Structures are given as structure tokens and as C-alpha cells.
């Protein structure tokens, strides 16, 4: 006779992410040549690492201006990729289509003041578990980095992945988390005639930044 098979129930339904391919209908089509076109990228994290994009602050600006008063807090936000400061970056635009991430997030702080305007800034990482600091003397006990302006205008700080789990969520649904994955705290230490100049800041993926479990929620 012929070869007997058992058509199994539960198998063969159309799954939208199956590793199978469709059957052809129209054969031997040769494409136009396409080798050595400029701008080839094969992975979205390659252009996320190679190209930093601006942050957002109040007033919808990519910069932060130096205040001259008693309180010296300059910026402060969360390590949610769904944060409002991160919301116009390419890194959050990738991170909205994935549920989990891991690794380092680079922040680029470059200074656009004049040559007679000097400043000294401090970036700090507050881990989750207690409320974040308001003073640079309180944030000196964190993981921090301090730098001042000069001939080299840009300073890159690498916010590390510190967590209990080795993968972290990219959002909360709606309900409640407090401020998990901690805070990024931008402080200024000193300034000399830097009244009202801009410090612009970019953000990009680190060297060991990885982003997994693809998802589609909404908002293209």
C-alpha cells in the first residue's frame, strides 16, 4: 500500500510567528543588483549604540540650564525606558517593542557655554530601596562621577545595570511600582559666569546593552 501517517490534532494551525515558510507560486525572478549600498544596518542595537539621541526636559528642550540659587539639583529621573525624559530617544523607541532589557545605558553630557563660562557637574546613580538624594553631599555616597568644562566639551557616563534579576522590564502596565530600577541624578557643583547657558545631553545604548522578548502594544 501507501505510507500511513497520523494527522495529529492541535498541529497545523496558522501561528503568526512560526518558523515555516509559504509555498511559492511564481518562480525564477532575478533581482536588480544591490551590493555595496550605503547605510546598511543589520541590528537595531548597532544604530542604537552608534547614534545617540537627545533627552527631553521641562519646556521641551534637549538641554538644561545652570541655576544660580541655594538648591543645586539640575535634573533627576528614573531608569524606566518609559520615562518622560527618555521618551524622545531612539533607545526608548526600540524599548517599547520589547518587554525586557539588560545592560548599560550611556549618557552624553556636552557643554555649549562660552569660553569664559565654567562649570562643574556631578552625575549620580541612586539604587532603588530608599528615596533619592536632593544634595550632592548626600549623593557623594552613591556611584557618581564628577567633571568640569574645558577643552573637551563632552563627558560620557555609563549608568550600570544593577538589579536583583538579570533582566529588567521596560514599562509598568498602569497599576503601581514606586520608582523601580532607581534614579539618575544630575547635579551641578560650581559655576563661574555660566548664568543661563545650556548643557545638552544625549543618550545611547552601552556596550553590553541587550533587549529581548519582542512585543507589540500600540503607538507606532
Amino acid at each position: 500500500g501507501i505510507f500511513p501517517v497520523a494527522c495529529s490534532d492541535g498541529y497545523g494551525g496558522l501561528v503568526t510567528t512560526d518558523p515555516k515558510t509559504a509555498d511559492p507560486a511564481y518562480g525564477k525572478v532575478f533581482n536588480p543588483p544591490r551590493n555595496m549600498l550605503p547605510g546598511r544596518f543589520t541590528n537595531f542595537l548597532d544604530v542604537a549604540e552608534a547614534c545617540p539621541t537627545f533627552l527631553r526636559f521641562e519646556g521641551d528642550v534637549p538641554y538644561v540650564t545652570t541655576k544660580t540659587d541655594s538648591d543645586r539639583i539640575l535634573a533627576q529621573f528614573d531608569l524606566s525606558l518609559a520615562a518622560k525624559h527618555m521618551s524622545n530617544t531612539f533607545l526608548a523607541g526600540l524599548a517599547q517593542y520589547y518587554t525586557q532589557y539588560s545592560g548599560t545605558i550611556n549618557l552624553h553630557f556636552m557643554f555649549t557655554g562660552p569660553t569664559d563660562a565654567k562649570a562643574r557637574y556631578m552625575i549620580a546613580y541612586a539604587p532603588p530601596g530608599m528615596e533619592p538624594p536632593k544634595t550632592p553631599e548626600a549623593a557623594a555616597h552613591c556611584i557618581h562621577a564628577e567633571w568640569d568644562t574645558g577643552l573637551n566639551s563632552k563627558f560620557t557616563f555609563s549608568i550600570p545595570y544593577l538589579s536583583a534579576a538579570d533582566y529588567a522590564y521596560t514599562a509598568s502596565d498602569t497599576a503601581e511600582t514606586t520608582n523601580v530600577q532607581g534614579w539618575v541624578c544630575l547635579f551641578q557643583i560650581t559655576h563661574g559666569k555660566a548664568d543661563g547657558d545650556a548643557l545638552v545631553v544625549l543618550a545611547s545604548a552601552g556596550k553590553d546593552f541587550e533587549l529581548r522578548l519582542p512585543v507589540d502594544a500600540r503607538t507606532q
Binding site: 511559492p24 525564477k28 546598511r40 544596518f41 543589520t42
Partner: protein, 46 residues
């Protein structure tokens, strides 16, 4: 290459499954990301 995970070779030939490429005569952002300056610029003390 993409989202395919079968280990048995395809029943149809390559001429009928896909469009065939033509040569004349990844991939930039991989080299642009790999050429990133990673160290320090100044003189590291302590």
C-alpha cells in the same frame, strides 16, 4: 537567517522560493558601532 527554524532542507528550489540576487562589478553601523572610542582621554590617577 530570519525567523526560520527548520532543519530539513526546503522542498522547493531557491529559484522558486525567493527572488535571486544579482552581483555587480551589519554593515556600516556595525563598523560605526565597533569603532566607538571606549577608553579615557586624560591621564587616569588612582
Amino acid at each position: 537567517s530570519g525567523n526560520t527554524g527548520s532543519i530539513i532542507n526546503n522542498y522547493y528550489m531557491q529559484q522558486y522560493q525567493n527572488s535571486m540576487d544579482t552581483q555587480l562589478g551589519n554593515d556600516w553601523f556595525s563598523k560605526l558601532a565597533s569603532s566607538a572610542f571606549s577608553g579615557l582621554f586624560g591621564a587616569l590617577l588612582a
